[model samples]
Target: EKDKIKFLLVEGVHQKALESLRAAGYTNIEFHKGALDDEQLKESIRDAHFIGLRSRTHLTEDVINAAEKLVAIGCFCIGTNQVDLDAAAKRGIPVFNAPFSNTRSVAELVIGELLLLLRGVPEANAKAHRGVWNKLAAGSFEARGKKLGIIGYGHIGTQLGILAESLGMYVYFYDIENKLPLGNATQVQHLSDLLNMSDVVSLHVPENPSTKNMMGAKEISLMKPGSLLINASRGTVVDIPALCDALASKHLAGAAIDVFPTEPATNSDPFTSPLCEFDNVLLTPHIGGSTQEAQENIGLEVAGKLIKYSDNGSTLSAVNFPEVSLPLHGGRRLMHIHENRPGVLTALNKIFAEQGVNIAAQYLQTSAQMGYVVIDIEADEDVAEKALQAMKAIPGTIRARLLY
Candidate 1:
């Protein structure tokens, strides 16, 4: 194994990930315990080949451009919105995430919040604290026989569907992609159809261009009056101000929101959302998947994935690159990163042909603007020197590394 690969961990990734990277022979790793400014992040990442991060850190375009040596990004959480994926893709950097690591944690929260909202537990607890004897069942109900509408039926949404059905709720869901319904759950053709049919609506969508402010006033107005809303997904997916309007006007019965448009980095940061003042609204600081078990799994999963890529050039489940796996040859493997342009592969092959090197195995993948190629060959007498000079001279070349 070569000693050129380095990693930078931010926002305290899981210990398992760190262990896995170390096991893969990545000894030149650094951890930043504190948040970094733009300059600091750039300086820290100057020599890094890979970076791992959770939420709370932003990888802007400028920062991505500055890190000329960076090859991959590991997002230790479900959402990749914090990192500019398009920018990374354009730069030929692949991003990986643990999409299913915390599915159960988020699903469990959805079920629990559904019961809380149905039974009006938050209001009852508040009344008890105020010394008011407000024991009444006027608006309380059971989850059984109620309708559950889930948006974005990905891993978390699909898992929550199975749990919600187990509790005897009739499940209906909608997704931008055509995901097959789970068990007895039904899929609706239109978003409005799901909203109208469900008694409770839960959002499990990603925060992308299509899903930002997805459930705004227009969509909220289509829901059945007095319906409950739960969002354990992205903050921007639900318009908090629109939800507050509906709750304030008594158009919706109740809501449980775990994410917001803007969140405080620390506990001391001021939280200013209109939903804070509503008694029927349950607002949380996005702890749906903060369980110890989930965090550890995410850490280990992403770390292991990164190690696999580093060791054997496997890119299974990578968010930004095509999935491929190549076996290790007897000699070293050269991983090349370049901008996605015509004739890159031709140039690479031409170089190999001129050097008379016998290629054992080779694979190539491309993103929107970048291309990656991995070549494994027997240790030739002069192949290394000639290949290095040829690869460095290729146009649009960003980085080229030799790995075992």
Candidate 2:
């Protein structure tokens, strides 16, 4: 049965996922290098039972509806914004992600960019490559004794603060919620305070309504003159035009940006940003979490979750489903996904009693939209299979599975 399940992986997801899936005896797999268009995606995913993708491939509602046999989705990255989560959940599909697997990679990238901007390495490299060997230390400064401010004190922010403390830099962080400090890091009460006092500012917040244009013209003006800035977070968090103005007017010393408000769908597409015109600005593709270590961890973490869900209907870390962690009981198991309404459990009990199925163990969880239940039955294989079919044919049933 595991050999019959087809897996489609897109956007160069790490090989660790493939290894884990194959180790679990799932060998029917197809791998694609880059993202496909919506039409191409709909066609390619029509017959797939399981799908894994990175940030590039977008699983829209149309594409998702075309997937006839999709059981679950594995996003080999931190965020699930690329998938139509509501649509998937309504079809009894669970979405899983590796939320903390790449925090260290992003934090390290931000630290490197901060140091390069503080010492004016990008400008020096640009000038020297043009045969101009004019080198000076007038604008360069040491990392020690510099004040570093972090915008969001989540996983990446706390990791960055600890690293900054190790470099002898005082760290200050601001967040909507009160967060404990790590090492010598201090939490500022206000965002303005962190911006006004720090010599280097790094953004680590997510993209949302409140965070959109969080670092616009007014906020950039509040930073101490000649300060450096780095953004390894979402592109919409910072206003690129405002940042370009800051660099053009020399209000801020330099800036390094890894994300953009509007990015190309693929690598072959052209990219144009006003920040690229300035020598003090450094730009990179959205590769903050693209390190080999991070990708390998993400692949293994998400794939492990997918395997667990497929094997025994365990949805412990699923983002869009009612979570139920099932143990490997030595008996036949019946899995049911149904609408969140009354009388479903009562109906399930009736079916089991009618089939003379002895319930060894049962786990059930629910959300506003759906209910997920797993039942371990002490019955013969044929009897248990009939019970599963009866449960699947129920009025509120969305999907059902049988395991032995």
TM-score of each: 0.83, 0.92
For each candidate, the alpha-carbon lDDT, in order, equals 0.84, 0.89
The digit string of per-residue lDDT tens for model 1 on 1-404 reads: 34667899988787777787777778778887655777888998888889998877898888888887887899998778888887887766778998878889999999998988988888778678888777889889999999999998899888999999899999989988888887998989999899888899999888789998989999999999889999988888888778889999988889998988888979998988878787777888989898988989998999888778777777778887766667665786777888888988888877777767777889897766677788887766466766877788888887676665
Task: Give the candidate number with the greatest lDDT.
Answer: 2
Error of 1 at 188 (Å): 3.0
Q: Model 1 residue 337 lDDT?
A: 80
Q: List candidate 2 stretches off by more than 4 Å.
A: 36-44, 79-82, 354-356
lDDT of 2 at 205: 92
Q: Model 1 Cα RMSD, Å?
A: 3.6
lDDT of 1 at 122: 80
Clashing pairs in 1: none
lDDT, residue 218, model 2 = 94
